[PDB]
Subunit: 90 residues, 6 copies
């Protein structure tokens, strides 16, 4: 399965910038966004593991420049069950 990269920010503008930086940094698809309240929002990308790492590294740094980064994480081999509960599928 494709790897999963995620960036979480507090603020949508930082996430939109994170998302742009991600999809331009590597061969990843922006497959989902989720807001959970408290000002926290998450963007989800899929690609190969090396792609997700380069994508999320660019996006994290991009987000830090304009807003508040909360988390950045790659799961190389995300479990199939995750797709049913979170917006990570294509």
């Amino acid at each position: 399965m494709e790897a999963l990269g995620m960036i979480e920010t507090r603020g949508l503008v930082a996430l939109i910038e994170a998302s742009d930086a991600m999809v331009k940094a590597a061969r990843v698809k922006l497959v989902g966004v989720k807001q959970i309240g408290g000002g926290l929002c998450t963007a989800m990308v899929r690609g190969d593991v090396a792609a997700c790492k380069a994508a999320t590294d660019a996006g994290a740094a991009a987000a830090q420049r304009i807003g508040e980064l909360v988390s950045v994480h790659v799961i190389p081999r995300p479990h199939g069950d995750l797709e049913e509960v979170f917006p990570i599928g294509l």
Copy 2:
């Protein structure tokens, strides 16, 4: 009834990582996610007591590595009334 395992984080990325660690660690069913404002989000799994303990321990440790773990708990025998009111059923 099956046991109930729950992890609650502040931040969705910590929760996706916890949920991944959970379903990988033991044979549990990821049976829902719930947000309640303030950035708090909870994931629920059902399995036998041994599986829910193994799942939640794995998820807790994993969430803690990348974000804010709020709560982790197993209810070995959740009361039938809970399924009516909370999204712990299948």
Copy 3:
């Protein structure tokens, strides 16, 4: 009229553990759960005064072990008007 027991937590996992402990401690019916944002959620039970007291005492202890208790309270004889505006009826 039935008494009303209720617990409010900051965190859903503490509320679910509290609710389980309530319906197991006394003969009370778990009638509603409400979320009002900022992470705050409330579980409401109905039964006789002694039952709601036993239940909410047990629920409060259960909750604060694993999460944050905001409020615990019994109203022995709730006014009819509460039922039209709050989710406390059957």
Copy 4:
């Protein structure tokens, strides 16, 4: 027009107790409740001015015993326009 009394708490349980104490303290009708996020919720009563003062005074003190009071206020002659935008009408 009837006077308007309002209590705002951070926490629902405090508000439910405030509401019970209000309707038992004076000849007021509990006409509405509104949650606005951040944990803030508001209960609205209508009656004569003296009723709303006694109602809100009892409710305020009731709420302070079990939770966090945010505001308590009586408008003796609330403008007609308020009814269209807020849950204060009968």
Copy 5:
């Protein structure tokens, strides 16, 4: 186009008192209320510039007496684009 007056509070009671003071102070139309999480809520009125200024000054002072005033502002000639996007229209 008509001028736009807005008051924003943290807390609904402060906002209801502000709105009351507004419609009583000048000939303005209360054209909506908006909540955005965190306890923040905004009331909007439309009238001529003189009326919106009179309204918002009255509301701001009144809200301050009983709660947390966050913002108060008049836009004499709000751009047509704003009505499309925000609930300032009738």
Copy 6:
């Protein structure tokens, strides 16, 4: 493709003042407003790079005269994927 300007505030009144200042500073179109909780709201404009820069500079100054600015940013050339996941299109 059009550039994307955006401002995020904690407070709706500051965002409406910022948005007014944006559409009045340059040839941009106010295309979306998003709220994500915790009081955070975002306005999004489209136009050429120079226009979004002028707009967002003006909006950021206007926002901070009356409220709290969280983020201001221009993406000169946003990726197509942003449009499928965020409200930035026409």
